[PDB]
Write a protein that binds this ligand. Structure first.
Ligand SMILES: [Mg+2]
Ligand SMILES: [Mg+2]
Ligand SMILES: [Mg+2]
Ligand SMILES: [Mg+2]
Ligand SMILES: [Mg+2]
Ligand SMILES: [Mg+2]
Ligand SMILES: [Mg+2]
Ligand SMILES: [Mg+2]
Ligand SMILES: [Mg+2]
Ligand SMILES: [Mg+2]
Ligand SMILES: [Mg+2]
Ligand SMILES: [Mg+2]
Ligand SMILES: [Mg+2]
Ligand SMILES: [Mg+2]
Ligand SMILES: [Mg+2]
Ligand SMILES: [Mg+2]
Ligand SMILES: [Mg+2]
Ligand SMILES: [Mg+2]
Ligand SMILES: [Mg+2]
Ligand SMILES: [Mg+2]
Ligand SMILES: [Mg+2]
Ligand SMILES: [Mg+2]
Ligand SMILES: [Mg+2]
Ligand SMILES: [Mg+2]
Ligand SMILES: [Mg+2]
Lengths: 139, 131, 135
RNA sequence: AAGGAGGUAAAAAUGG
RNA sequence: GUCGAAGGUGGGACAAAUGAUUGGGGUGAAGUCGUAACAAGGUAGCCGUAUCGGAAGGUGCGGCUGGAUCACCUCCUU
RNA sequence: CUGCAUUAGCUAGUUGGUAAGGUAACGGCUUACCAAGGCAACGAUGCAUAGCCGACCUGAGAGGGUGAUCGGCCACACUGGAACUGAGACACGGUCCAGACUCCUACGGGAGGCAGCAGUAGGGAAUCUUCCGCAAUGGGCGAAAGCCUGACGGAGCAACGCCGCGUGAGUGAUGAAGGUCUUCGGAUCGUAAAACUCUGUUAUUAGGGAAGAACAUAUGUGUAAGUAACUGUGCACAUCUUGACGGUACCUAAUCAGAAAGCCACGGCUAACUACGUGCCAGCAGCCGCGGUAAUACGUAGGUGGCAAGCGUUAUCCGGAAUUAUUGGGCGUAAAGCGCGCGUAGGCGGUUUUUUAAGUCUGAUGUGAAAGCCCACGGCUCAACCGUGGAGGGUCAUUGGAAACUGGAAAACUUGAGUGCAGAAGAGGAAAGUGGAAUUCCAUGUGUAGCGGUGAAAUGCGCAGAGAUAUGGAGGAACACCAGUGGCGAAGGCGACUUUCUGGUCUGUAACUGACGCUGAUGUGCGAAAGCGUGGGGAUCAAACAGGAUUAGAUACCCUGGUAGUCCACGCCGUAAACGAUGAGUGCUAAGUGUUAGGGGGCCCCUUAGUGCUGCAGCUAACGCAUUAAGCACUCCGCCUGGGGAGUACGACCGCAAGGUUGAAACUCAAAGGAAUUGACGGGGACCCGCACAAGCGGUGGAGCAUGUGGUUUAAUUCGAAGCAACGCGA
RNA sequence: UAAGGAACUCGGCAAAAUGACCCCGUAACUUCGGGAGAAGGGGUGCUCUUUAGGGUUAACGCCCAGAAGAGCCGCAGUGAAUAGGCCCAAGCGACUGUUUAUCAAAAACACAGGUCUCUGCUAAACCGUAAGGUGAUGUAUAGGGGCUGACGCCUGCCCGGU
């Protein structure tokens, strides 16, 4: 890892030398990927980085960013109470989770009647759902 | 113990002037007597008397107050001190209060005022400022 | 103090510290050492890019980058303006000037220098954000 | 008559 | 042959980097436990020292007033 | 001419002498001998950093910062050593050796040193052309023409800086269109624009076109030294020729307002305000801060402000900062007086006389290069710039003068400081001895069921006879009244009495010494309590500890016990709010009134030294201090420089240990603090009042019933009211 | 005993190596004694010249004993023999000592030091039926027994059971 700066500089010089060789960072995986015209191309470029630029590097198959989803629908409830100590905090929600049509994305609907949930906290509920779904629930 | 008789004399004069005393008795010395004579000549004090007694004698100053009881002496400041002595050239002689005051000096030609030092083109140890 | 005391131990002035220490140091690779040199900016590589929460009473998601400088010192630099195109391994120019809200952020990333792009849609004070004249 | 200094008792539930 | 750079061997000195692990320190958002201090802060507080206790802290010994206070005598000032 | 003591010892050819060798030269420069010298708290040695200066930036100055360009001096030339040649080198583009590194090779062997000028790679935020010419100045060689000269003279690139000029000027209300705001009238961009007229700095085109150039050499004469006389040589006057820049600067003629304005800011500091979007988000920010629906602080638009071929940001230095204070600050409570003595070096020092001239003052001479800064003048059209004079700049050196002060020498004085003589008080210290009260324990007689304790309790002690009471004994510790803003001591501290040894202080006298003094780094001692070691002692009290109680809990406060310790001897530790939070010495500056120990003059007056209170002038942010200053002055010492981090870490020294002394930084905040003011509050106080107590009459609480309320139940038992100030209340 | 040099082996077992005298020099740590012969290095024969000395003697003489220089020889001079290998760490026991005669020498025992406990003297404890003895011709700073085991810093809670 002490040679990552040398690796970046070598990649820059090599991209200026060869138009067909590309290097980019993937945000999701936080990995740097090198694209070439073939196995021979990438092998020669790896060896040239190792020797000419004195940056020994290892290469592998790029990691694939997976996603999760719900296959079954269900009504569910969550209730958090923290009144035992000091300040007391109460929250309670009842949400139906449904498998959305593939590719439609997350969809939040607010079927609140009677103001049981103050309208002030509904955006907070949506933000909590978004954070929690950003964090995986299975893997 | 005592370390600056000139300082002490000036401080006696200052304290008496503050309290608006009329006379002032201090132990005498040649330098104190010359300073007192310079003050009398310049007009800051009324009179000077010397008592030639034993134990070095005494100097009896009589202070001068103007009309409305105003004080003729605004302030006296010791310049050269035992801890750090100050000397000046003829061309570097200081003017007290833009000339409205005197700087008492000690010179090869006797202790005189800064005006006389500048006139005779001499320097020396700046004993005190008075204004 | 007495004059004699000053003469024995002279007066000593308070020493002044730099607000941007990371810019005052260069690095010699051959001798593998640091060297004292005052610089107005330094190149660096963004080790991390992200957001930080300011201290009270302010509230926000302030954009910043953890940068390794050319002298091997790792610092937090604020990213000014609306929107930025920085990620890890981006090469950025860093100048002095801390962000009062952010505790450990003592430098700024220059906009419109090296990889960093100018602020898109900026029309007043454009030089401060590296935006060309639209015309 | 009103203020400054020293000694010296007797009393006491708990939470705001 | 003398002197003699570099080199070799040896035990020490000094400086810097780095090190499993470890120590307290600072900062931080509505965190948890109690409530030490500020009123006599509900056991006056603080200083030095010792020991004890989750924690603030408690307790003992000496010291300070930078301590409030009802009744008493003892003087001193106008 | 530099930082560190968290570097105190260094030095053995080292210091000196003798002899010799060696060198341009003196010399431990080197060697032989003899000696033990030399340096150092006036900072040696060690470590770190650094070329020095003229100067440059800043500042009113004093100062602070810096050491690019240009000039001087030094040092170095891949690293180290060496010598050769030479007048000169221990030699950048020389030699030899060694080392590291690199290159060529036919593998036998060879070669190299850009910190010369360009340029390449690398590092970096960042710094240029592998340019033209020796025409000018200078240098080397040559008799000279001349050759060489990446010195130098030029050109190229870079807004990098400074200076200069542009991007147009006059008229122009008819306030044109259009943007923005609007109170829907209008305001503003705005004489701005349009249009008419004018100029060409600039720009384009075409012509003319410098100076810098002196020369040298060569050719003619004239003159001067020498010659027997020429050629030659010196000098003088003439003539041909010599330009990289460059057909550049500059000048002339014609054409066109036509090609030539951007940056930041507009909440306060700080010149400049409005509308929209956003809505503690996005964002801004040097500080204070701004942003959650009315944002002059975020983004855009109009307008405005400051600058302008520049404008902003970052970095660094000085300033503002008197925020290290010599100029020019402080230490009672804001940071700061060592806990206190004794005392070394150093700093400072009473009065008079004579003398010296180190400091001090004054005149002359030399020098402080040039360039620079400042003043003046001159030349580029101006300016920057260039040139020329002046002035300035030393803590400089030599020399001649003055003697008041500081310094040196000599001689006197008694006022300060000590001593003698006559007196005074004292819980000053050390060691032995004696004594009364009280507590605890032990033994015994009488005696019964409690004692003790607290807010209330319980633990505990007691039916074995407790507690109480009486007598006797054992032992330890402290000394009731006197006792007092009283006394003594440097401080800590010292309180029964007696004896022995011993310290200090105060009063009067004026013989006696004659300045012998003050302060005091480093050092050396004492130093409350706790604590430690050894050996004793052990009543009381009492950390730890056990039990009881209180409490939501109670590792406490309270209660019952209880060990170390509290006491003694000898050692150790060396710290306290060790405080007057106030260093020591000295003198001066209104007063009133106590008290302690004296003295003098008539209950009174005066006076010395303490100890208190009140209070002028003066001081202070205020509180307050105020002859026992925190006033006015002088000397010396110690200490401070925002709050945390931290009295911490590291190093050092001390300690048995506990720890003590010395003592940072990174990082973090914009505060932390003092005195005083107004409120509010207090499990602070004083006083005053009220059917608040008290005096008294009658009630409620007890019974039945009416009604309201809580609870429960129900389909609902509608909702509201909850201490006083909800409950025959909204009703 | 070539080259190698722990690759051997459970293990460097054995062997090898060091070894004398003089000189230089010598660390952490420490209870300040030490560690230490630390470590790590240099010298060592013979001849001659010059020369400071000490003991014994009138002296000569005899004996002891250095210093400097110049030479000579060998592969090699404490020329043979005899004469420490050293260092860095960890566990255990403080240390010198003692022990299974004849398979165990150690970390076991002992130890100086600590503490508990008994014992007022015809002591307690021990031997013996007793007499008589040890203890001790001692007397609580003494004597017996238990446990611990230099030194340094310490040694907490429980008395329900025995
Ligand atoms: Mg409390
Ligand atoms: Mg309290
Ligand atoms: Mg306790
Ligand atoms: Mg250097
Ligand atoms: Mg200033
Ligand atoms: Mg050369
Ligand atoms: Mg070269
Ligand atoms: Mg070059
Ligand atoms: Mg680069
Ligand atoms: Mg200043
Ligand atoms: Mg303070
Ligand atoms: Mg004091
Ligand atoms: Mg202290
Ligand atoms: Mg000059
Ligand atoms: Mg004690
Ligand atoms: Mg108790
Ligand atoms: Mg103090
Ligand atoms: Mg008095
Ligand atoms: Mg072999
Ligand atoms: Mg093996
Ligand atoms: Mg063996
Ligand atoms: Mg053993
Ligand atoms: Mg055996
Ligand atoms: Mg055996
Ligand atoms: Mg044992």
């Amino acid at each position: 890892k002490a040679d990552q700066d040398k690796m970046t500089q070598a990649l820059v010089k090599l991209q200026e030398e060869d138009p067909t060789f590309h290097a980019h960072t993937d945000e999701e995986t936080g990995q740097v990927i090198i694209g070439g015209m073939g196995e021979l191309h990438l092998d020669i470029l790896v060896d040239r980085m190792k020797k000419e630029f004195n940056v020994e590097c290892n290469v592998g198959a790029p990691m694939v960013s997976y996603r999760e989803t719900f296959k079954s629908s269900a009504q569910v409830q969550g209730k958090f109470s923290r009144q035992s100590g000091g300040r007391g905090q109460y929250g309670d929600v009842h949400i139906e989770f449904t498998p959305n049509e593939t590719g439609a994305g997350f969809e939040f609907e607010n079927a609140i009647v009677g103001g049981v949930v103050p309208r002030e906290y509904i955006p907070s509920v949506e933000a909590g759902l978004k954070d929690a779904m950003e964090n995986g629930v299975l893997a | 113990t005592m370390t600056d008789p000139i300082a002490d004399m000036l401080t006696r004069v200052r304290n008496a002037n503050m309290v608006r005393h009329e006379k002032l008795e201090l132990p005498a010395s040649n330098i104190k007597k010359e300073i007192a004579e310079i003050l009398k000549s310049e007009g800051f004090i009324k009179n000077v008397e010397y008592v030639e007694d034993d134990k070095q004698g005494v100097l009896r100053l009589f202070l001068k107050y103007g009309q409305n009881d105003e004080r003729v002496i605004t302030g006296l400041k010791r310049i050269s001190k035992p801890g750090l002595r100050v000397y000046a050239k003829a061309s570097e002689m200081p003017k007290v209060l833009n000339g409205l005051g005197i700087a008492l000096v000690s010179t090869s030609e006797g202790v005189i005022t800064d005006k006389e030092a500048r006139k005779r083109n001499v320097g020396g140890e700046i004993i005190a400022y008075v204004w | 103090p007495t004059i004699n005391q000053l003469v024995r131990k002279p007066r000593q002035s308070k020493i002044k510290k730099s607000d941007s220490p990371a810019l005052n140091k260069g690095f010699n690779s051959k001798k593998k050492k640091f060297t004292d040199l005052n610089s107005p900016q330094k190149r660096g590589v963004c080790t991390r890019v992200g957001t930080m929460t300011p201290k009270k009473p302010n509230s926000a998601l302030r954009k910043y980058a953890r940068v390794r400088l050319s002298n091997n010192i790792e610092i937090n630099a604020y990213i000014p303006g609306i929107g930025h195109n920085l990620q890890e391994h981006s090469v950025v120019l860093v100048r002095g000037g801390r962000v009062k809200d952010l505790p450990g952020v003592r430098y700024h990333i220059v906009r419109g220098a090296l990889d960093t792009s100018g602020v898109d849609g900026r029309r007043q004070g454009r030089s401060l954000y590296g935006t060309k004249k639209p015309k």
